[PDB]
């Protein structure tokens, strides 16, 4: 019983010791690969091979580190919080960003903007662009064959019965796969809190555009005179809104004669809706901010002010020292 | 004279319906009453109008000024009064800035037009200046400027000029009429181009279904030993500037290098005739030949017509519509472009108007590929169209590029022979456009 | 105020006249004489079996095209070709359900699981035949081929050839015509009819001379090098039907000439090897299937040179 | 110079990478051997038990069995003209009250579909076959493994005077004739060859 | 709250046969009957449980350069002990699965789970993971074996269904007849997963 | 003559993948491209060629004249694991680092079921040194040929309309079954 226990133990132990020493030696001489600082950013990435990239994959994005060949904020899909998580392994960064969704600047649906001729070929937007640009009467509108839906990886676009795409805000993750795939340059990225958008891309004059579509832009310029923040400009015979200067006052919406500007008139009307707690009867807002809207006498708390006018821009919500004014949208519907 | 023979590999044999208008005489259009002249009748930079509404113009007076080096001037076809300098519908599907002139009934010639000279005293510099001054572009279809073509860079060497007489698209006949009628002007234009470039060799290549044109050219050449005539087998892609070079000279243009790197200068016969005519008379390019034919035309014919006349005027002059058309095409059946309206004027590169009926314009829907392999056998560049089309249909541009999709000449032969009625050449065009666009946004 | 309403598309604006249905109908027309010979020799049950297979194939296809929400493309006559060629590979003593099972296997699994027409890489009829031979060997081996009225033959010519009993074999003229006691598959006995159909298909431009010519030449040279009779090897078995009709399938063959030559040489070599030293009396089906497997490897080494380029010596990516 | 004189400690970390592995292997051995000490012999018993079943089911009788010293087996294999030796494994003699009853013979024939089979048979005093069985085979479970079933029953009743021939037919014709399984003929031929060699051995021994 | 999630990952969410597609050789080899699959799954589950617990009990002293020899040593010891016991007491199952019982050491699931879950977790989680993976393996093997046996033999668990005149499909019990079957099954699962 | 016949039987007649069900997981794993299949094949060939000789020497010089035949599997797998660890060390340094795209199948070479399988087959068949080397080389070459053919077929199928639900693993299994039938044509040959 002694020998039958002793012999296999010795044989297997000698084999294991020799193999271990050999592998330990072969750790040197051969591969060392000199690659420090194990990735540690793939866990902070969450990547799904979306496409706002072009370095060969998220794993290669984690493996390309410590060479300094990539930008810190290269991935826009995750956001500034994702960038902070990724680069927080090294640190010295902080930031924030704004969420965005895809949108379609067109509202001509197969009966207000009909077709000039009949098209033969494959049902694709670029294939139709080969056939001399398409068969629609408007040369800037939607073809309706859903290339943007075909290139979407997160299943966020559907094609309606009227021929225009619809985007789900809960499945769209702020990329541009549909933006550079559209042959008409129609898909755009807009902040999620924006409701005032000019939906047209027609670069013709008034008469030709009027003959082409029902809701075309005739470049009259009546929306520019309504805006006092210089946020909407008419260029190339078409109007466009700058979302950085837009206070959402809902004036250009009512002033348009061809119904090109989106949004419904339900806004504002909160002229000095002042909380009585944190105002000292200063009375500085009674004098002037572009409308009258406040006039009275001293206005000790509680304030006695009738509300029938003013535009509800929002500057008075912040310019107060104590910010006693509260804005609540309360109108019809 | 010693007439040699040539051929190439690949190609198709269409019905070649040219017998309708080949035996009819040549017609001449009536005096127009209104012309629309666009500012872009070439490739490059469009011109700038130098006339206003209410002005009075002469015949041959310039109405557009060139912008850069690759740009030609634009002249007037009739004498009358300017009524509009707005923008008007174009053959490309959109609207282009144009000048509209209403005729006066009298063809008053601008009192600044005189003959340039003769062959023996003009030399290369003045020949090139005269070619630029008259606004001559390429009448073979692409409308590339000719004065840019005759300027060889110092790092290139050429030794021969070849004239393209191998008219190969069906239904088209105007080149046959021009060669049988005005051969001496063609020979004179060939000589002028040879002197301008500075070579001592010239070739003319004509297909063998136009034998009377071959005899006319042989008789017109005379005792000159530096000029030769070739006979080519009747096939469709024979005349595409590359198969012609391979058939006549035996050389091959390199992969993306232009014909100038093979030492050849290729020019159409109509361009040579226009060069000779403009040298002799001193008048610019304002008139050319056309073939009005098809299934819905009452009286098809080949007719000489000025530049700026609408399509509907030509159709009305050729009898009219025997039945309601289903397709109107500018050019031939293999490479033409379908139109939306009939208000389009004729241009410098317009060689025919083809109107088909509703029964002849119908094609069945595409089906599954059956792997027969005929597209591989008909390609003159020796590509594999099925693989490129299938890769392009699912947005794989890297596989399209690695399969040599950028050297397709877009001849259409692959799409003609498919039993499944697929749309191969359009898919190859989509792939080429995507590759070219990606080369700019990533570089 | 009359309008025009023209059509806009891309070039070209003319097409050729041939289509898929014309090609398939021409294949059926070419296969007709072998059907006539089979009906004359074997009787009325030889035709009925054929009908059964055809019906099954068509039915199967339609059902799938109704369930997957696809257009029903059954008027291109391709399932008819598959059913006829599958029915030609059966003995006279086979039950009615064998054709149904083989047709369902050939259409549902081989063809429609890969996308449909032209989207597979393997031959449907030969794969179905191999599946039938593996699953039910008692209904497909060496006794089902002799009619029940004859009781003297008891062996088909290839079995007698492999056993050395050459003196009891039928005459070479009889094997060429198939009219004086030659038994086997119903649509394989006569080589004259298959040759006539193949010549008709070559004349129409549907197939070419390369595959059948090189197949038969390789078989003859292999037979001559080992001291056997080449003509007897060519006019016996199922090599004429395979050479002219089954090795020339569009979806499982190379598209270039050099690949087709290599394909035919390999087919002939494997066929003769399995015939001489294998565990089967015939090796046509397995040789064709094995060359179907190897086709994508041949295609990447035998592609033509492109106009323009003048070769790069593997130094453009270093 | 050992890649520019690795600094001392680089060898110490080698030692800790060996010893641990060593002890792990030792522990593994210290298990396996012990299990062998309580298992292996028991397994052997099971084997011989099955063997004795094969020696009792083939020859159903109440008697005793005796084994040759295996030298006579090699002597019989050397003589008679056995082309392939070492194909006869065990020969036994059945004794009941002195009178010889028969012999039980085990043979392993080659030339099967998947290699070598093991066939045991038993022959009485007057030449008859009292039953055959298959001990070890590696054929296909659905095609060649059917030999250890109904097909084994038909071997009884044949006389040990002449050889046996297999036919691929339903009709069994006449004497000394074997009908094979449909779609499986090589296994039947191998079993019949083993039976024939056992018959030859019994004919030589009983003379 | 964490033991149950690891236990139930197991059969459905991360099935080794239907999702990970691992351990394919015994799956395509022994599943010609509904009895072989159950026994193979049970033996594999025992070995997996033992190896996972033993490896997770030693994830503090094993260096990263000699991990594979230690892993295979532990797995081979467990496989050898199990095979010795099965030879001692169950000879029929050992004879039916003769070559793949020594091959349990190389099964593509034990080593895959050793370097993915056991090397970085505690004893409690590894036990649940091993139990779930073994149950999923056994269930998949039993289903595949039953499906193949019914078509290729006409019986379920040795009990005949169609009579004594049935002619089976002998390709289903052959090596080419396994592949196709498994593929179809996986396709069905996909059709009921993305569409629902 | 014996060596040529044993090589022919190892490559064609008795293929390890399409007949014996041995190298299946890397067959279905890394056969998406033709470039990776060649490297996997050459690595497999190196491992089997090095393992066969060492297993032969260990079995016939130590295990047999000591009555320790119950230690075959653990010793064999220890040798194979050490070889695979050395190969894994070598590949990322000297071989291209872009070839670490297996990403699970590189440490699973020890589990390939065809290295240990061929070692056990060599031991059971009672061969010699040269016969064992030839058998290992033939098995490796058969594995390489099968995986290259599979990769080529998959590259061809990349342009086909597999509907939406079969795709990768089901279509790979169906393709493998069809190739298995075609190789089932290679049966009954006696060499
Ligand atoms: C398919 C195809 C066919 C062509 N056929 C002709 C033709 O018949 N005649 C011709 O003059 N140019 C033809 N061309 C144009 C030539 O390629 C080339 O541009 C022309 O000879 C230049 O003439 P130019 O110098 O007068 O512009 C064809 C081009 C293509 C792509
Ligand atoms: C020349 C030619 C040969 C064909 N050969 C076969 C054949 O051998 N087997 C078959 O099932 N179908 C055959 N077909 C028809 C079949 O539907 C098609 O070729 C594809 O194999 C189906 O994917 C053939 C068709 C043609 C045109
Ligand atoms: S955009 Fe970001 S998440 Fe998407 S694939 Fe690129 S790196 Fe990954
Ligand atoms: S938005 Fe652009 S891509 Fe989408 S359907 Fe309209 S034209 Fe096509
Ligand atoms: S809708 Fe456009 S931006 Fe949104 S996920 Fe889809 S492709 Fe990306
Ligand atoms: S006019 Fe404006 S809204 Fe109408 S189709 Fe054109 S782009 Fe769209
Ligand atoms: S008011 Fe409306 S139509 Fe006028 S310019 Fe503004 S957007 Fe265009
Ligand atoms: S909503 Fe108000 S701020 Fe915005 S563009 Fe219109 S007028 Fe200007
Ligand atoms: S603090 Fe604000 S609310 Fe109060 S008086 Fe001043 S401006 Fe008005
Ligand atoms: S700041 Fe703007 S919103 Fe506030 S009261 Fe003045 S005008 Fe109205
Ligand atoms: S269009 Fe392009 S691909 Fe088609 S035949 Fe012509 S050159 Fe070849
Ligand atoms: S011609 Fe059409 S059907 Fe034939 S191979 Fe080419 S693409 Fe396919
Ligand atoms: S290779 Fe055999 S189980 Fe994975
Ligand atoms: Na197996
Ligand atoms: Na074991
Ligand atoms: Na295993
Ligand atoms: Na792993
Ligand atoms: Na197999
Ligand atoms: Na796998
Ligand atoms: Na097989």
3-state secondary structure A151-188: HCCCCCEEECCCCCEEECCCCCCCCCCCCCCCCCCCEE
Domain total of chain E? 1
3-state SS assignment for residue A127: helix
Distances (CA, A) of B265 to B68, B141, B185, B201, B237: 23, 16, 19, 11, 19
Within A283-328, where are the H helices?
Answer: 316-319
Q: How far is CA A312 from the centre of its chain?
A: 25
Write out residues 17-46 of D within 8 Å (CB-CB) of F.
Answer: 25, 28-29, 32, 36, 40
List Cβ<8 Å contacts ≥24 apart for B390-396. Answer: B390/F159, B391/B431, B391/F159, B392/B427, B392/B428, B392/B430, B392/B431, B393/A122, B393/B427, B395/A151
**Per-residue DSSP letter, B29:** P
Name the residue with tokens 């069995």. Answer: D65
What value, to the nearest 5°, has the Cα angle with vertex B80 and ends B74 and B83? 80
Name the residue with tokens 């056997």. Answer: C228
Answer yes or no: do B338 and C8 touch at CB < 8 A.
Answer: yes
Its domain, for residue E162, covers 3-191
Name the residue with tokens 């008679």. Answer: D80
List CB-based neighbours of ion ligand 16 within 5 Å: E 26, 103, 107
3-state SS assignment for residue D41: helix
Whether the Cβ atoms of residue C250 and residue C209 lie closer than 8 Å to each other: no
How far is the C-alpha of A320 from the C-alpha of A301, rounded, in Å?
A: 16
Whether the Cβ atoms of residue F6 and residue F139 lie closer than 8 Å to each other: no
Where b means 16+ CB within 10 Å and e means fewer, C79-118 reads: bbbbbbbbbbbbbbebeeebbbbbbebbbebbbbbbbbbb
DSSP output for A72-100: TT--TTT-HHHHHHHHTTT---------E
The structure tokens listed for F38 are 């060649």
How far is the C-alpha of A86 from the C-alpha of A64, rounded, in Å?
A: 13
DSSP output for B258-271: -GGGTTEEEEEHHH
Question: Which domains are seen in chain B, by residue range?
Answer: 3-23+115-281 (3.40.50.11540), 32-106 (2.40.50), 289-362 (3.10.20.600), 374-441 (no CATH)
Within chain C, where are the H helices?
Answer: 20-42, 44-67, 78-87, 96-104, 124-135, 157-162, 172-177, 191-203, 210-225, 230-234, 239-241, 257-277, 284-293, 295-299
Q: Where are the domains of chain D?
A: 2-55, 62-205
Whether the Cβ atoms of residue B260 and residue B156 lie closer than 8 Å to each other: yes
Q: How many CB pairs under 8 A join D and F?
A: 8
**Per-residue DSSP letter, B108:** P
How far is the C-alpha of A9 from the C-alpha of C25, rounded, in Å?
A: 78
How far is the C-alpha of B346 from the C-alpha of B311, rounded, in Å?
A: 7
3-state SS assignment for residue D105: strand
Answer yes or no: do E69 and D21 touch at CB < 8 A.
Answer: yes
> D–B contact (≥3 CB pairs within 8 Å)?
no
- The minimum-distance atom of ligand 2 relative to the CA of C116 is 23
Whether the Cβ atoms of residue B276 and residue B192 lie closer than 8 Å to each other: yes
Is B11 an interface residue toward C (CB < 8 Å)? no
Among E26, E51, E65, smallest CA distance to E111 is for: E51
Return phi, psi of residue B119, to 5°.
-70, -30
- Give resolution in angstroms: 2.8
How far is the C-alpha of E177 from the C-alpha of E182, rounded, in Å?
A: 9
Q: Say if residue C265 is exposed, middle or buried (CB neighbours under 10 Å; 0-12, 13-18, 19+).
A: middle
The structure tokens listed for F26 are 């890397």
The structure tokens listed for F156 are 């061809």
Other CB atoms within a 10 A radius of the CB of residue C177 amount to 17
With contacts defined as CB-CB under 8 Å, which chain C residues touch A119?
7-9
Where b means 16+ CB within 10 Å and e means fewer, E99-133 reads: ebbbbbbbbbbbbbbbbebbbebeeebbbbbbbbb
Helix axes F168-184, C124-135, angle to 10 degrees: 70
How far is the C-alpha of A253 from the C-alpha of A259, rounded, in Å?
A: 8
Residue E196 lies in a domain: no
Among F13, F40, F35, F34, smallest CA distance to F150 is for: F34
User: For residue D164, how many C-alpha atoms fall within 13 Å in the half-sphere facing its CB?
Assistant: 28
Distances (CA, A) of A48 to A78, D139, E69: 11, 50, 35
Regarding the beta carbon of B303 and ligand 1, being less than 6 Å apart is answered: no
What value, to the nearest 5°, has the Cα angle with vertex D96 and ends D91 and D99? 90
Answer yes or no: do A15 and F75 touch at CB < 8 A.
Answer: yes
DSSP output for B340-352: S-S-PBP-TT--E
The structure tokens listed for D122 are 């038993």
How far is the C-alpha of A73 from the C-alpha of A82, rounded, in Å?
A: 9
Other CB atoms within a 10 A radius of the CB of residue C165 amount to 12
Is F66 an interface residue toward A (CB < 8 Å)? yes
Q: Pick one of 1.20.120, 1.25.40, 2.60.120, 1.10.3430 as the CATH number of C21-299.
A: 1.10.3430
Contacts of residue D180, Cβ cutoff 8 Å, sequence gap at least 6: D166, D167, D168, D188, D189
Please tell me which residue of chain C has the smallest CA distance to A135.
C8
Answer yes or no: do D28 and F70 touch at CB < 8 A.
Answer: no
Name the residue with tokens 């006979």. Answer: B231
What value, to the nearest 5°, has the Cα angle with vertex C174 and ends C169 and C180? 90
Chains touching E, CB cut-off 8 Å, 3+ pairs: A, C, D, F
Distances (CA, A) of B120 to B7, B151, B188, B276, E28: 36, 21, 12, 13, 91
How far is the C-alpha of B48 from the C-alpha of B65, rounded, in Å?
A: 5
Among F181, A65, A200, smallest CA distance to C129 is for: F181
User: For residue B4, how many C-alpha atoms fall within 13 Å in the half-sphere facing its CB?
Assistant: 11
How far is the C-alpha of B208 from the C-alpha of B206, rounded, in Å?
A: 7
Among E182, D112, E49, E153, smallest CA distance to F21 is for: E182
> E–B contact (≥3 CB pairs within 8 Å)?
no
Name the residue with tokens 């604006």. Answer: C13
Contacts of residue C215, Cβ cutoff 8 Å, sequence gap at least 6: C239, C242, C243, C247, C264, C267, C268
How far is the C-alpha of B151 from the C-alpha of B143, rounded, in Å?
A: 16
Other CB atoms within a 10 A radius of the CB of residue B169 amount to 21
Among A325, A287, A293, A328, smallest CA distance to A309 is for: A293
The structure tokens listed for E135 are 């149950």
User: For residue C212, how many C-alpha atoms fall within 13 Å in the half-sphere facing its CB?
Assistant: 21
Q: Are strands B160-164 and B264-268 parallel, antiparallel or unpaired?
A: parallel
Whether the Cβ atoms of residue A216 and residue A210 lie closer than 8 Å to each other: yes
Name the residue with tokens 């080992």. Answer: C226
Reading phi first (left if > 0) and then psi (alpha if -120 to 50, else beta), residue F19 is in: alpha
Tell me if the bond preceding A221 is cis, omega within 30° of 0: no
Name the residue with tokens 């094949």. Answer: F41
Chains touching B, CB cut-off 8 Å, 3+ pairs: A, C, F
Strand order in the sheet with D118-124: D64-67, D88-96, D99-107, D118-124, D129-136
Distances (CA, A) of B153 to B197, B219, D197, F123: 11, 35, 97, 77
The structure tokens listed for C120 are 């597979």
The residue of E54, E69, E77 whose CB has the most chain D CBs within 10 angstroms, and thus the best one to mutate to test that interface, is E77
The structure tokens listed for B367 are 């089906």
Where b means 16+ CB within 10 Å and e means fewer, A125-154 reads: bbbbbbbbbbbbbbbbbbbbbbbbbebbee
Whether the Cβ atoms of residue B4 and residue B228 lie closer than 8 Å to each other: yes
User: For residue D58, how many C-alpha atoms fall within 13 Å in the half-sphere facing its CB?
Assistant: 29
Residue whose Cα lies nearest atom 14 of ligand 2: it is C249
Within chain E, where are the H helices?
Answer: 3-8, 24-30, 34-56, 67-89, 91-96, 110-114, 123-153, 175-191
By Cβ distance, the residue of E108, E175, E187 closest to F180 is E175
The structure tokens listed for A190 are 């807009």
Answer yes or no: do F93 and A11 touch at CB < 8 A.
Answer: no
With contacts defined as CB-CB under 8 Å, which chain F residues touch B391?
159
3-state SS assignment for residue B356: strand
Return phi, psi of residue D181, to 5°.
-75, 140
Q: Say if residue B398 is exposed, middle or buried (CB neighbours under 10 Å; 0-12, 13-18, 19+).
A: exposed
**Per-residue DSSP letter, A289:** B
Tell me if the bond preceding B124 is cis, omega within 30° of 0: no
Is C316 an interface residue toward B (CB < 8 Å)? no
Other CB atoms within a 10 A radius of the CB of residue F169 amount to 17
Is C45 an interface residue toward E (CB < 8 Å)? no
DSSP output for C107-164: IIIIITTTTSTT--SS-HHHHHHHHHHHH-GGGSSSSTTS-TT--S--S-HHHHHHTT
Whether the Cβ atoms of residue B6 and residue B408 lie closer than 8 Å to each other: no
The ligand whose atoms approach the alpha carbon of A124 most closely is: 4
The structure tokens listed for B183 are 């051969």
What value, to the nearest 5°, has the Cα angle with vertex E134 and ends E129 and E139? 130
Residue B74 belongs to what H/E stretch? strand B74-75
Whether the Cβ atoms of residue E30 and residue E97 lie closer than 8 Å to each other: yes
How far is the C-alpha of A58 from the C-alpha of A76, rounded, in Å?
A: 13
Whether the Cβ atoms of residue A174 and residue A242 lie closer than 8 Å to each other: no
* Chain E positions touching chain A (beta carbons under 8 Å): 65-66, 69, 73
For ligand 4, mutation pick of A119, A140, A184, A189 (most atoms within 8 Å of CB): A184
For ligand 12, mutation pick of B364, B368, B374, B385 (most atoms within 8 Å of CB): B374
Helix axes C284-293, F168-184, angle to 10 degrees: 140
3-state SS assignment for residue A119: strand
Contacts of residue F101, Cβ cutoff 8 Å, sequence gap at least 6: F30, F36
Reading phi first (left if > 0) and then psi (alpha if -120 to 50, else beta), residue B404 is in: left
How far is the C-alpha of D42 from the C-alpha of B137, rounded, in Å?
A: 104
For ligand 2, mutation pick of C31, C122, C250 (most atoms within 8 Å of CB): C250
3-state SS assignment for residue B443: coil
Residue whose Cα lies nearest atom 2 of ligand 7: it is A256
Answer yes or no: do C7 and A131 touch at CB < 8 A.
Answer: no
Residue B355 marked as a ligand binder: no
3-state SS assignment for residue D132: strand
Distances (CA, A) of B201 to B53, B185, B194, B217: 50, 18, 8, 16
Residue E92 lies in a domain: yes
How far is the C-alpha of B18 from the C-alpha of B167, rounded, in Å?
A: 11
The structure tokens listed for B23 are 């035996």
How far is the C-alpha of F61 from the C-alpha of C252, rounded, in Å?
A: 53
Q: Say if residue D111 is exposed, middle or buried (CB neighbours under 10 Å; 0-12, 13-18, 19+).
A: middle
Name the residue with tokens 């080593």. Answer: E111
Is B395 an interface residue toward A (CB < 8 Å)? yes
Answer yes or no: do E84 and D46 touch at CB < 8 A.
Answer: no
Among C56, C43, C151, smallest CA distance to C105 is for: C56
Regarding the beta carbon of A282 and ligand 9, being less than 6 Å apart is answered: yes
**Per-residue DSSP letter, C316:** S
Write out residues 8-47 of C within 8 Å (CB-CB) of F.
Answer: none
Residue B329 belongs to what H/E stretch? strand B325-330
Q: Where are the domains of chain C?
A: 21-299
Q: Are strands C7-8 and A118-119 parallel, antiparallel or unpaired?
A: parallel
**Cross-strand pairs, B329:** B338, B354
**Per-residue DSSP letter, B145:** B
Residue E114 lies in a domain: yes
The length of chain F in residues reads 191
How far is the C-alpha of C234 from the C-alpha of C219, rounded, in Å?
A: 7
Regarding the beta carbon of F25 and ligand 13, being less than 6 Å apart is answered: yes
For ligand 6, mutation pick of A198, A200, A209, A217 (most atoms within 8 Å of CB): A200
Whether the Cβ atoms of residue B100 and residue B63 lie closer than 8 Å to each other: no
């Amino acid at each position: 019983m002694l020998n039958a226990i002793l012999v296999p133990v010795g044989i297997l132990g000698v084999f294991g010791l020799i193999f271990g020493i050999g592998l330990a030696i072969a750790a040197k001489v051969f591969e060392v690969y000199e690659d420090p600082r194990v990735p540690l950013v793939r866990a902070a990435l969450p990547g799904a091979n979306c496409g706002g990239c072009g370095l060969p994959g998220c794993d290669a994005l984690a493996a390309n580190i410590v060479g300094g060949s990539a930008a810190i904020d290269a991935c826009p899909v995750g956001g500034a919080s994702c960038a902070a998580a990724v680069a927080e392994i090294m640190g010295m960064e902080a930031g924030s960003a704004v969420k965005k969704v895809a949108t379609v600047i067109c509202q001509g649906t197969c009966e207000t903007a009909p077709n000039r001729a009949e098209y033969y070929g494959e049902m694709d937007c670029r294939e139709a662009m080969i056939a001399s640009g398409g068969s629609k009467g408007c040369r800037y509108g939607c073809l309706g064959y859903g290339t943007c839906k075909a290139v979407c990886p997160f299943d966020a676009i559907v094609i309606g019965e009227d021929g225009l795409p619809k985007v789900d805000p809960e499945k769209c993750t702020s990329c541009g796969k549909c933006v550079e795939a559209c042959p008409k340059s129609i898909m755009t990225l807009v902040p999620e809190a924006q409701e005032v958008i000019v939906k047209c891309h027609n670069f013709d004059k008034g008469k030709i555009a009027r003959l082409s579509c029902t809701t075309a832009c005739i470049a009259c310029g009546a929306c520019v005179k309504a805006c006092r923040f210089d946020a909407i400009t008419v260029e190339n015979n078409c109007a466009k809104i700058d979302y950085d200067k837009c206070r959402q006052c809902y004036e250009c919406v009512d002033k348009c004669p061809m119904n090109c500007i989106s949004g419904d008139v339900e806004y504002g009307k909160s002229t000095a809706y002042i909380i009585e707690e944190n105002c000292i009867a200063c009375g500085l807002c009674a004098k002037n901010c572009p409308v009258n809207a406040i006039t009275g006498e001293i206005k000790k708390p509680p304030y006695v002010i009738d509300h029938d006018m003013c535009i509800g821009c929002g500057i008075c919500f912040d310019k107060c020292r104590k910010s006693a004014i509260e804005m609540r949208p309360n109108k019809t519907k | 004279m010693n007439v040699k023979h040539g051929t190439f590999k690949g190609g198709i044999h269409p019905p070649y319906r040219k017998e309708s208008t080949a035996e009819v005489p040549l017609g001449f259009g009536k005096k127009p009453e209104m012309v629309i002249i666009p500012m872009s009748l070439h490739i490059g930079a469009p011109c700038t109008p130098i006339v206003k509404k209410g002005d009075t113009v002469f015949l041959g007076q310039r109405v557009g000024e060139p912008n850069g080096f690759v740009s030609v001037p634009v002249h007037a076809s009739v004498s009358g009064k300017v009524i509009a300098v707005e923008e008007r519908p174009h053959a490309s599907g959109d609207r282009v800035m144009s000048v509209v002139i209403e005729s006066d009934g009298l063809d008053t010639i601008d009192p600044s037009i005189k003959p340039y000279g003769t062959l023996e005293d003009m030399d290369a510099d003045a020949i090139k200046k005269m070619v630029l001054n008259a606004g001559i572009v390429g009448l073979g279809g692409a409308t590339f400027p000719t004065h840019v073509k005759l300027a060889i860079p110092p790092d290139k060497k050429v030794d021969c000029v070849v004239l393209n007489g191998a008219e190969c698209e069906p239904y088209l006949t105007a080149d046959h009429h021009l060669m049988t009628s005005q051969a001496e002007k063609v020979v004179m234009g060939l000589k002028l181009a040879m002197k301008s470039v500075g070579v001592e060799k010239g070739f003319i290549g004509v297909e063998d279904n136009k034998t009377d044109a071959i005899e006319a050219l042989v008789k017109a050449i005379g005792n000159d030993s530096r000029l030769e005539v070739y006979s080519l087998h009747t096939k469709y892609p024979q005349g595409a500037e590359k198969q012609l070079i391979a058939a006549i000279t035996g050389r091959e243009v390199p992969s993306g290098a232009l014909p100038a790197d093979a030492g050849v200068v290729v020019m159409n016969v109509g361009t040579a005739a226009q060069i000779a005519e403009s040298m002799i008379t001193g008048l610019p390019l304002y008139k050319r030949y056309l073939t009005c034919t098809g299934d819905a035309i009452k009286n098809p014919q080949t007719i000489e017509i000025r530049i700026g006349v609408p399509f509907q005027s030509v159709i009305d002059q050729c009898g009219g519509f025997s039945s309601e058309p289903g397709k109107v095409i500018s050019g031939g059946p293999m490479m033409g472009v379908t139109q939306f309206v009939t208000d389009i004027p004729v241009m410098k590169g317009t060689s025919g108007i083809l109107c088909l009926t509703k029964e002849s314009a119908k094609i069945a829907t595409p089906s599954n590929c059956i792997h027969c392999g005929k597209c591989v056998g008909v390609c003159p560049i020796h590509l594999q169209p099925l693989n490129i089309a299938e890769y392009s249909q699912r947005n794989m541009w890297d596989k399209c590029e690695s399969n040599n999709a950028m050297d397709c000449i877009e001849c259409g032969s692959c799409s003609y022979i498919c039993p499944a009625k697929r749309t191969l050449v359009s898919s190859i065009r989509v792939a080429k456009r995507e590759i070219i666009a990606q080369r700019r946004k990533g570089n | 105020m009359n309008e025009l309403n023209l059509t806009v598309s891309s070039s070209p604006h003319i097409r050729a006249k041939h289509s898929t249905a014309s090609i398939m109908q021409n294949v059926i027309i070419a296969l007709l004489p072998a059907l006539a010979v089979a009906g004359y020799v074997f009787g009325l049950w030889a035709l009925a079996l054929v009908a059964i297979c055809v019906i099954s194939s068509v039915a199967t296809e339609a059902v799938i095209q109704k369930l997957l929400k696809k257009p029903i493309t059954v008027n291109d006559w391709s399932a008819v070709v598959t059913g006829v060629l599958l029915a030609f590979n059966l003995p006279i003593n086979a039950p009615w359900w064998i054709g149904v099972v083989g047709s369902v296997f050939a259409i549902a699994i081989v063809k429609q699981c890969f996308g449909g027409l032209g989207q597979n890489f393997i031959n449907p009829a030969l794969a179905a035949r191999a599946f039938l031979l593996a699953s039910w060997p008692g209904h497909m081996t060496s006794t089902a081929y002799i009619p029940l009225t004859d009781t003297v033959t008891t062996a088909t010519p290839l079995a007698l050839l492999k056993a050395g009993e050459t003196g009891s074999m039928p005459s070479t003229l009889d094997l060429f015509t198939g009219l004086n006691g030659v038994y086997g598959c119903i649509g394989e006995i006569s080589a004259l009819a298959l040759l006539i159909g193949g010549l008709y298909l070559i004349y129409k431009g549907i197939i070419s001379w390369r595959i059948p010519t090189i197949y038969l030449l390789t078989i003859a040279i292999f037979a001559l090098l080992v001291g056997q009779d080449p003509i007897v090897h060519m006019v016996s078995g199922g090599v004429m039907l395979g050479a002219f009709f089954m090795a020339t399938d569009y979806a499982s063959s190379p598209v270039t000439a050099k690949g087709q030559i290599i394909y035919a040489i390999g087919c002939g070599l494997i066929t003769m090897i399995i015939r001489l030293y294998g565990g089967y009396p015939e090796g046509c089906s397995y040789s064709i299937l094995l060359m179907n497997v190897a086709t994508p490897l041949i295609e990447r080494f035998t592609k033509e040179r492109i106009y323009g380029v003048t070769k790069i010596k593997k130094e453009a990516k270093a | 110079m050992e890649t520019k004189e690795k600094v001392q400690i680089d060898w110490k970390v080698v030692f800790k990478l060996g010893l641990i592995l060593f002890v792990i292997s030792a522990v593994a051995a210290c298990a396996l051997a012990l299990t062998n000490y309580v298992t292996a012999g028991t397994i052997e018993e099971m084997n011989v038990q099955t063997n004795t079943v094969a020696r009792q089911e083939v020859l159903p009788k109440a008697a005793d069995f005796e084994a040759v010293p295996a030298k006579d087996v090699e002597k019989i294999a050397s003589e008679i003209g056995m082309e392939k030796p070492e194909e006869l494994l065990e020969v036994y003699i059945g004794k009941s009250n002195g009178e010889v009853v028969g012999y039980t013979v085990k043979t392993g024939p080659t030339s099967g579909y998947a290699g070598e089979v093991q066939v045991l048979t038993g022959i009485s005093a007057d030449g008859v076959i009292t039953g055959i069985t298959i001990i070890k085979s590696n054929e296909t479970p659905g095609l060649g493994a059917k030999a250890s079933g109904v097909w084994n029953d038909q071997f009884t009743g044949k006389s040990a005077k002449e050889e046996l021939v297999v036919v691929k037919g339903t009709t069994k014709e006449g004497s000394n004739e074997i009908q094979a399984i449909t779609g499986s003929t090589i296994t039947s031929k191998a079993v019949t060859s083993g039976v024939n060699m056992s018959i030859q051995v019994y004919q030589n021994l009983s003379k | 709250m964490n033991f149950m999630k690891n236990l139930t990952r197991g059969i459905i969410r991360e099935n080794p046969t239907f999702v990970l597609v691992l351990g394919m050789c015994p799956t395509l080899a022994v599943t010609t009957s509904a009895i072989n699959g159950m026994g193979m799954g049970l033996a594999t589950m025992l070995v997996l449980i033992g190896s996972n617990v033993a490896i997770s009990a030693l994830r503090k002293v094993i260096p990263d350069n000699i991990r594979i020899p230690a892993f295979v040593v532990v797995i081979a010891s467990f496989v050898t002990i199990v095979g010795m016991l099965m030879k001692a007491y169950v000879p029929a199952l050992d004879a039916a699965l003769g070559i793949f019982i020594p091959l349990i050491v190389v099964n593509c699931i034990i080593l895959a789970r050793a370097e993915a879950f056991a090397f970085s977790n505690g004893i409690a989680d590894s036990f649940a993971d091993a139990v779930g993976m073994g149950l999923g393996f056994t269930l998949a093997l039993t289903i595949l074996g039953s499906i193949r046996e019914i078509l290729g033999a006409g019986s379920i668990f040795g009990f005949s269904l169609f009579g004594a005149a049935y002619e089976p499909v002998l390709l289903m019990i052959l090596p080419p007849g396994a592949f196709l079957t498994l593929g179809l099954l996986i396709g069905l699962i996909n059709w009921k997963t993305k569409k629902a | 003559m014996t060596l040529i016949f044993i090589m022919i039987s190892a490559i064609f007649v008795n293929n390890f993948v399409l007949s014996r069900f041995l190298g299946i997981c890397p067959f279905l794993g890394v056969s998406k491209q033709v470039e990776t299949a060649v490297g996997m094949g050459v690595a497999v060939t190196f491992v089997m060629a090095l393992a066969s000789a060492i297993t032969y020497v260990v079995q016939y010089a130590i295990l047999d004249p000591l009555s320790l035949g119950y230690l075959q599997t653990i010793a064999f797998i220890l040798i194979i694991a050490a070889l695979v660890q050395l190969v894994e060390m070598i590949i990322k340094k000297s071989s291209p680092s872009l070839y670490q795209a297996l990403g699970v199948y590189l440490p699973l070479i020890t589990t390939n079921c065809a290295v240990l399988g061929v070692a056990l087959i060599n031991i059971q068949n009672e061969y010699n040194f040269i016969e064992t080397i030839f058998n290992g080389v033939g098995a490796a070459l058969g594995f390489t040929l099968a995986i290259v053919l599979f990769a080529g077929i998959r590259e061809r199928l990349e342009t086909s309309a597999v509907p939406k639900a079969l795709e990768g693993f089901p279509i790979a299994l169906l393709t493998a079954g069809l190739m298995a039938i075609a190789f089932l044509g290679f049966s009954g040959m006696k060499l």
